[PDB]
Amino acid sequence: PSRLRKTRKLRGHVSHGHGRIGKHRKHPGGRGNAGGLHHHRINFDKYHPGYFGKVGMKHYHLKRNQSFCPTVNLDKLWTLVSEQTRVNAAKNKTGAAPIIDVVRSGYYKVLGKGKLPKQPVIVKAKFFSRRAEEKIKSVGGACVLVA
Amino acid sequence: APSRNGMVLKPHFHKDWQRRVATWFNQPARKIRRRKARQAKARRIAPRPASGPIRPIVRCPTVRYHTKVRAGRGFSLEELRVAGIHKKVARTIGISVDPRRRNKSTESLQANVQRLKEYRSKLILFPRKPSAPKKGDSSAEELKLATQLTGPVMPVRNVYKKEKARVITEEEKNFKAFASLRMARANARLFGIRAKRAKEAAEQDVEKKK
RNA sequence: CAGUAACGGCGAGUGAACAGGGAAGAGCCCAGCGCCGAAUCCCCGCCCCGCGGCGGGGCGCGGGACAUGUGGCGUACGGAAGACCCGCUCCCCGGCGCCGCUCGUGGGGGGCCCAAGUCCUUCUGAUCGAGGCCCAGCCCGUGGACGGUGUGAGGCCGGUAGCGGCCCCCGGCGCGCCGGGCCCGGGUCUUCCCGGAGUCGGGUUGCUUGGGAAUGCAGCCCAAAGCGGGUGGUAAACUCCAUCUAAGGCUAAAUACCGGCACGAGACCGAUAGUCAACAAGUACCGUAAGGGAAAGUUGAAAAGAACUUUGAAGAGAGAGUUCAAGAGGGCGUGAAACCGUUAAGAGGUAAACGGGUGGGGUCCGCGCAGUCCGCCCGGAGGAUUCAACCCGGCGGCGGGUCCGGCCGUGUCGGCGGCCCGGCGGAUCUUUCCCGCGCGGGGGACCGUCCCCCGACCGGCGACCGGCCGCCGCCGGGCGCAUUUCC
RNA sequence: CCGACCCGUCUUGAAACACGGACCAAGGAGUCUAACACGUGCGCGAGUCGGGGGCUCGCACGAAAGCCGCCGUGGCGCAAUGAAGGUGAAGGCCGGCGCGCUCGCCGGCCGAGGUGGGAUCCCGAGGCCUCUCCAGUCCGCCGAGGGCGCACCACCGGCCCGUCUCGCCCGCCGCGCCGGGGAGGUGGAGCACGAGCGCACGUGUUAGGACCCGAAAGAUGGUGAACUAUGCCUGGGCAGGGCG
RNA sequence: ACUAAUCGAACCAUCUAGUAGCUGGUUCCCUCCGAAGUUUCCCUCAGGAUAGCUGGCGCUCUCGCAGACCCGAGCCACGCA
RNA sequence: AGCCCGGCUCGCUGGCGUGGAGCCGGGCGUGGAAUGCGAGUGCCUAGUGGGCCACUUUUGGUAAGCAGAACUGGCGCUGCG
RNA sequence: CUACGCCGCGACGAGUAGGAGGGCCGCUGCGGUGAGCCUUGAAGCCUAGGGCGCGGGCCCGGGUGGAGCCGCCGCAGGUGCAGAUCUUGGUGGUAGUAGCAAAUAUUCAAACGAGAACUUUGAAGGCCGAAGUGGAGAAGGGUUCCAUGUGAACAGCAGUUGA
RNA sequence: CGGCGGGUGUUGACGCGAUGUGAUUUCUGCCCAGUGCUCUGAAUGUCAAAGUGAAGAAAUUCAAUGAAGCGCGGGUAAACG
RNA sequence: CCCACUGUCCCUACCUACUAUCCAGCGAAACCACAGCCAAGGGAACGGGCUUGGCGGAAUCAGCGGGGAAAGAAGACCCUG
RNA sequence: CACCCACUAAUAGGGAACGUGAGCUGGGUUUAGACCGUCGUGAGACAGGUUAGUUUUACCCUACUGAUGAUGUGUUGUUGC
Ligand SMILES: [Mg+2]
Ligand SMILES: [Mg+2]
Ligand SMILES: [Mg+2]
Ligand SMILES: [Mg+2]
Ligand SMILES: [Mg+2]
Ligand SMILES: [Mg+2]
Ligand SMILES: [Mg+2]
Ligand SMILES: [Mg+2]
Ligand SMILES: [Mg+2]
Ligand SMILES: [Mg+2]
Ligand SMILES: [Mg+2]
Ligand SMILES: [Mg+2]
Ligand SMILES: [Mg+2]
Ligand SMILES: [Mg+2]
Ligand SMILES: [Mg+2]
Ligand SMILES: [Mg+2]
Ligand SMILES: [Mg+2]
Ligand SMILES: [Mg+2]
Ligand SMILES: [Mg+2]
Ligand SMILES: [Mg+2]
Ligand SMILES: [Mg+2]
Ligand SMILES: [Mg+2]
Ligand SMILES: [Mg+2]
Ligand SMILES: [Mg+2]
Ligand SMILES: [Mg+2]
Ligand SMILES: [Mg+2]
Ligand SMILES: [Mg+2]
Ligand SMILES: [Mg+2]
Ligand SMILES: [Mg+2]
Ligand SMILES: [Mg+2]
Ligand SMILES: [Mg+2]
Ligand SMILES: [Mg+2]
Ligand SMILES: [Mg+2]
Ligand SMILES: [Mg+2]
Ligand SMILES: [Mg+2]
Ligand SMILES: [Mg+2]
Ligand SMILES: [Mg+2]
Ligand SMILES: [Mg+2]
Ligand SMILES: [Mg+2]
Ligand SMILES: [Mg+2]
Ligand SMILES: [Mg+2]
Ligand SMILES: [Mg+2]
Ligand SMILES: [Mg+2]
Ligand SMILES: [Mg+2]
Ligand SMILES: [Mg+2]
Ligand SMILES: [Mg+2]
Ligand SMILES: [Mg+2]
Ligand SMILES: [Mg+2]
Ligand SMILES: [Mg+2]
Ligand SMILES: [Mg+2]
Ligand SMILES: [Mg+2]
Ligand SMILES: [Mg+2]
Ligand SMILES: [Mg+2]
Ligand SMILES: [Mg+2]
Ligand SMILES: [Mg+2]
Ligand SMILES: [Mg+2]
Ligand SMILES: [Mg+2]
Ligand SMILES: [Mg+2]
Ligand SMILES: [Mg+2]
Ligand SMILES: [Mg+2]
Ligand SMILES: [Mg+2]
Ligand SMILES: [Mg+2]
Ligand SMILES: [Mg+2]
Ligand SMILES: [Mg+2]
Ligand SMILES: [Mg+2]
């Protein structure tokens, strides 16, 4: 809605909100990111440090699919199965532990943030972190690897 | 000019973009035209499935998608050969064929040939001359049982094998997943240089006494 | 994917691809290597069947092309030839007659048609306006889009709706026949045969790319191989692996469309706007030329476009006339401002103009000109149903242990109640009853939400409602006809 | 009668001998797209979003609206850090043990620590009552103190990744130039019970004609020797006298 | 000098709405708040960035909200200048 | 967030139960000058970045309605006597 | 007591550049709504008419006009002008002014005619003076040539004349 | 732009082309250090690509060789001066 | 520089033609914030307007060149970009 | 400015946008042509010399110069202050 804008209020004021002295000119200071090392250097150094220069090794033909490896944390681990699964495992008389396939749920690596409920569980994952494995073993579970 | 905090922006509008602007006001018309073409084609091939030939079960290539499975271009010649279908008759009876696809493993081969056999079982074949049924099908199962199929023929569906909860054994409890992964990475990294060092040690060993 | 990998005085800036999901989906042909008595093709004469894009068949000791290579088989998905076994499986071409009538309901093109007020009274210059049209209401409505008509019209007219009608023409779909072609397909084994060269590749140069020790293209020089060659995004050597098979060719669909033909529409513009162009506009006109390039819409419903008389040489006037209107008179709808003429009023030697404050004059306004109203009461002089209270009927409001139901919310029981005779889901267990190798799909059990139910207990009649009572209020009809009530 | 210089504009300063403005009418200048940032409104919420496609008499409206759910592919968010190989965010108490050696083996609990502030909430001795009293019935207000403490702030601890320094253990189908662990500093756009996603609006910045008008220039492709400059071809023309 | 009234590089159309830190203009009303010409850096000195000065949006708290008319019944807020 | 009592921890320090720092309980309100005022905190942000003048201090200059600084106020942005 | 309402008390009020809020200020179009207005007169325009609002502006009376228009709730803009040596169009003062002064020159009578300084005829006085103000062509123009008629406009006065 | 393309040139040193000075008369002095121009390659220094050799597994590296030009050596002022 | 010659001058005058001038007819343009009498003051430091004073009388004609820092051109000098 | 000649009573000094260019003139400076000297490799430069080089408009307002008139005395005239 153009009726809600400053232009409808700036009618009758000669400079249209841009001042009488400095005016509104075409491009004072340059176009785009002009002078980022010369006369906009303070702004660039203050708000975008690291902007200039090269760091690291370049790699031609990067394929994101090769490095595709989504992660899941242990605190969200039990959300990958049904509530029926967890309650049945908790109230199970036998020590049978449910299997959670994070690769089926769409995760390749299991990370160790959080804590697990005190009940055994088998976890199928491509990769495990050390603390995730430790915390799974703590509740009497097992970590099994898949390809 | 930059003004206080902000993101360094790089618009790609330096190249006279307004001569090449594709508006989409003909998008509803295009959808209507495509729907009309689909309906006309379905009417043209009256009892044949509207979507077209059956497609093979095909696993997606990269490591990002190899857990998923989808529909391929056509059945491979090895699949047709072990399913007993001629590669020139399959297209006539509505089976897509892909002469340039190979079968690296046997499981995908067997899955696709069971797919072909199931399709062949479900296929109703009309004789060329309706008054002279030579070898296609009985008229009883093609009078009223013939019906144009809507959607893909035998749509490819991802299947998950459910594992029942079981008792964890001591061997599974004593398996060290993180240590195994780290050692596997190290072994794959150092396999070649270990072989070279062993070769050099053997060279010294076979002449150490002289 | 992705403003990412990458390129970039690594500055400004630039910048893809793979995988994934869709739209569409279609595959093939030569050369070569070979086999087949050149099996091949063009042209010209003759005959017949046809014309509608010039074809078919036959004939010619008729010509020519062609062994410096035509045609058939055959092409990397291998192919050919022999045997052995099995299956006869059925192709396309142009007509004769007619269906299902081609099909979201005609397949297309063209032509002609199809509902209902000009009803009564009125407005007007004219009306399409206003009021009405007893039977639930003028009539039609599958038609109330639009346009025209002297306004503003569903019913006056054209149209509009309709798997509405009729007529003419054209095109493709099945059957029986017609003229002729049309030649064997698969599996196993054996024996053979298999490929594109001044091209790849390499050096250099220039351009190009995101391609970075060089992505692609090209010039010049060098110049291949056949378990070879290309690619495997960092130059190179060795090595393994993966992947394809270049230097020959064709191919629909999905896609693009500011020109063209024919349409439809719009929260667009409304004659200095919108195309330059609403109009005899790429016109008039300008420039030697290339080229530049306007301005310009509106009388009235109908010309009914002013007969006739009169002054003037005429332009132009005064009358008269048409019209609802010429205070609409052929650049004529309306007709602003700037500016000008005249009339009326006022004023005027510090240029006008302006702010504040009064005063005078003037044009108008106030139904100004004997000045409001209205509640109660008192007094006077008149009317009239009827005032109150009771009776009958109707209708409301409120309350009621739920008086009686209908129920409502939350739980609570047996599940009689549902995988046959109620659903939907579960990353929950199973044939240890059922069809695929000890390896699937079904069917079951359980669980979670359920569903309507048989009923009960808790809270409540709630703003979810009824019936009975009780109270109150209003209204209508009686009686009440005078110290009441009202005007 | 008193007061009163002409506006706009640049400017320290305009009535200026500073510029524009004779008058009137109509037109006339911060827009749209994209991308950000923050604020506000709405929906859903560890999710969110169908925008591309598809399905629905194909179409007056409708090119709309509705629906998809094994169309959620994908985008953004839910994890950071390192050039990279890679790695990747849970602690507090009561104990029995080596030797509880500043540490290794387990149990039982609980589940992101603590200090100082901290809206709000909770308890609360004691007060406020009537015609009065000895004697307790029910609840209302004030209330010194005390308690649990939201968000947020300051600080101290802890955890993840990089990198240094020190040092000792542990693991094995590969005993290795193998793998893992500790303590103490330090670098990080981190964790420490999520807050995002989509849509709309406003403001600000930027790329685009970019609020409107304005160069001297540069480039590409054409038209001109009817004027003039020069060469060529073919024509025409230039009284009367003097010197000699 | 001349090259069609144009010559220290003609004319025409197009790129082209070329760019401009420079000049000019920039359209309704009321209310509230209300500046700077200074610091640092810049081939910077007629310009920018940066801090300062401004506005807007808030948010976190403090004094209590007193008696229905009325009537207080040593000690009188976090913090700031 | 002060003062004063005890107690605990330390791998720092060290004749020492030493020093220092931290931590844990407890008790102290006459709130430890005057005066005034309600404070704290975050985000976004325009314009500006030519100034000029006066008292006083002050540099260059013979001086300047000159040029340059300090302090406060003003004009700019402000009418009124 | 339109709670987006109403009421009370206290203090305060300058403003460029700039920022913000409110607008029952204004323009155009769209979705709703007013059983809205209108040929018994819409829009527009004019007005010594009556008023309202601080203001932007608005309402009503009178006239002209002759067919459409507006309020409210939302939505959307090519939405408000005194300037830009602004664009287009129109109009003033200047001003009945500058001016209608290069190349010697006209006069008399008559005719036609409404009308004669300018036309025609006659008479007179002059000029070009054969390198012409004469007679004919090229280029260029394109019907200007010739006759008749007209007196709108044009021939910078006029015209009975005219390219 | 290009073609063994075209102008001088239907030409040939009494000719074409490029300069300076400016009739006649009388003269036109000194300077080759500088910058130009030009002649000579003499052992010759430097010197690119290609080619040659060596090392390496190759990329690559090194070495040898050595065109013009430049240096080295003459001439030239009616060349600039 | 000299002779001659003369209105170049002392030192101006007179005459002629065409204008200007007045009239009939016809009829522009430049320019224009508003306009138009001065002295001094102050002021962007040279006012038509403001302050203080001097003063001010319709409508005009022919001239004139003191002013309007007159008009004509976004200064060509100088500086900046 | 200067200097000289001669006369004279004396041959004083100055201002008025260094009075006065829509008053003139255009000799000088100060465009474009050209020559010399100096400077510069050069283009070119020189408060160095020299030569040739377009001087536009008033009809507006005021001022001034003249020329009709205007207000009042009833009209009008003469003579006057
Ligand atoms: Mg303002
Ligand atoms: Mg303005
Ligand atoms: Mg710099
Ligand atoms: Mg992204
Ligand atoms: Mg590019
Ligand atoms: Mg598809
Ligand atoms: Mg052959
Ligand atoms: Mg009809
Ligand atoms: Mg009509
Ligand atoms: Mg109609
Ligand atoms: Mg029809
Ligand atoms: Mg590599
Ligand atoms: Mg137009
Ligand atoms: Mg109009
Ligand atoms: Mg006339
Ligand atoms: Mg009329
Ligand atoms: Mg008219
Ligand atoms: Mg008048
Ligand atoms: Mg200005
Ligand atoms: Mg100044
Ligand atoms: Mg001013
Ligand atoms: Mg002045
Ligand atoms: Mg000036
Ligand atoms: Mg200026
Ligand atoms: Mg002007
Ligand atoms: Mg103007
Ligand atoms: Mg306007
Ligand atoms: Mg849709
Ligand atoms: Mg996904
Ligand atoms: Mg806390
Ligand atoms: Mg900390
Ligand atoms: Mg910002
Ligand atoms: Mg522009
Ligand atoms: Mg250039
Ligand atoms: Mg010529
Ligand atoms: Mg331009
Ligand atoms: Mg300026
Ligand atoms: Mg400035
Ligand atoms: Mg100063
Ligand atoms: Mg200022
Ligand atoms: Mg101030
Ligand atoms: Mg003041
Ligand atoms: Mg104010
Ligand atoms: Mg506009
Ligand atoms: Mg205007
Ligand atoms: Mg005159
Ligand atoms: Mg004259
Ligand atoms: Mg003569
Ligand atoms: Mg002649
Ligand atoms: Mg003639
Ligand atoms: Mg005339
Ligand atoms: Mg010569
Ligand atoms: Mg000499
Ligand atoms: Mg050499
Ligand atoms: Mg010599
Ligand atoms: Mg004066
Ligand atoms: Mg200028
Ligand atoms: Mg200029
Ligand atoms: Mg002077
Ligand atoms: Mg003068
Ligand atoms: Mg002059
Ligand atoms: Mg001169
Ligand atoms: Mg000169
Ligand atoms: Mg001369
Ligand atoms: Mg005159």
Coordinates of N, CA, C and O (backbone and C1' of nucleotides) and ligand atoms in Angstrom, one line a residue, chain G residues 155-158, ligand 51:
Chain G
rA155 P -1.1 39.3 -47.2 O5' -0.8 39.6 -48.7 C5' 0.4 39.1 -49.3 C4' 0.6 39.6 -50.7 C3' 0.4 41.1 -50.9 O3' 1.5 41.8 -50.6 C1' -0.8 39.9 -52.5
rG156 P 1.4 43.3 -50.0 O5' 0.7 43.1 -48.6 C5' 1.3 42.4 -47.6 C4' 1.0 42.9 -46.2 C3' 1.1 44.5 -46.1 O3' 0.2 44.9 -45.1 C1' 2.6 43.4 -44.6
rC157 C1' -2.1 50.4 -47.8 C3' -3.2 48.6 -46.8 C4' -2.1 49.0 -45.9 O3' -4.4 48.1 -46.1 C5' -1.3 47.9 -45.3 O5' -1.3 46.7 -46.2 P -1.3 45.3 -45.6
rA158 P -5.3 46.9 -46.8 O5' -5.9 47.6 -48.1 C5' -7.0 48.6 -48.0 C4' -7.2 49.2 -49.4 C3' -7.7 48.3 -50.5 O3' -9.1 48.3 -50.5 C1' -5.8 49.5 -51.2
Ligands
MG51 MG -3.3 44.3 -48.0

